[PDB]
Amino acid sequence: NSEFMRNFQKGQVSREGFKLVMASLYHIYTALEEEIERNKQNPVYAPLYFPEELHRRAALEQDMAFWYGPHWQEAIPYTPATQHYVKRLHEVGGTHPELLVAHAYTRYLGDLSGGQVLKKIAQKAMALPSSGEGLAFFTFPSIDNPTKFKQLYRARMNTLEMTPEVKHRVTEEAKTAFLLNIELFEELQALLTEEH
Fold first, then answer.
1. Binding residues for heme b
2. CB atoms within 10 A of CB 196
3. CA-CA distances (angstroms) from residue 106 to 16, 103, 181?
4. Cα–Cα nearest to 139, from 111, 160, 158, 105
5. Which residue, 37, 75, 13, 31, is CA-closest to 180?
6. How many Cβ atoms sit within 10 Å of the Cβ of residue 2?
7. All domains of the chain, ordered by start, with CATH?
8. 76 exposure class (CB count in 10 Å sphere: 0-12, 13-18, 19+)
């Protein structure tokens, strides 16, 4: 129970902490949201394919230009820990996607929960544009009632049939991502240590 990651859901972080986390998060969803595509037809995830209601990809692409300029593709960083999420992400999305169910949960709902509360607070605490620009990872133009979208994603996790030997791997996998997430906002806290 540390700090950095938390001082994030607030509106704390300097900004190069934000940018950082952003580029870290742009590197998580790409893989994620593409591997999710790689499996947009299998029973063990099929009921959770909501492309236009959650996907964060393009929004961060719209942001990674507001944070790192035009030459953002090759200018944006890719820390080693960011590289470790992406891997257990690729590793799952191609040969064991029944735990892929765990990632979309750790992410989206882990990211969503607090809707216009890290957008309607982050930009009013960073001299950011009021139209939303920059904080696009925090806006979902396809969710009228997000707390209700939750009933609809969690409920879709109920149609997901799976034996017990798997339901044990889906859960231990989420911890993995619960572990993979923390390790990030910790390296992103320590990666800042020496930066004049």
1. 105, 154
2. 2
3. 24, 5, 9
4. 111
5. 31
6. 10
7. 1-196 (1.20.910.10)
8. buried
Residue with tokens 């099929």: 46
First to last CA, the chain: 27
Structure determined by: X-ray
What is the per-residue DSSP string for the chain? --STTHHHHTT-S-SHHHHHHHHHHHHHHHHHHHHHHHTTT-TTTGGG--HHHH--HHHHHHHHHHHH-STHHHHS---HHHHHHHHHHHHHHHH-TTSHHHHHIIIIIHHHSSGGGSSTTTGGGTT--TT-TT--TT--TT-S-HHHHHHHHHTHHHH----HHHHHHHHHHHHHHHHHHHHHHHHHHHTTSS--
Known binding-site residue numbers: 105, 154
Q: Are 4 and 188 in contact (CB under 8 A)?
A: yes
Q: How many CB atoms lie within 10 A of CB 129?
A: 11
Q: Which amino acid belongs to residue 65?
A: A
Alpha-carbon distances, residue 155 vs 80, 82, 141, 152, 175 (angstroms): 35, 30, 21, 5, 21
Contact of 127 with 135, CB cutoff 8 Å: no
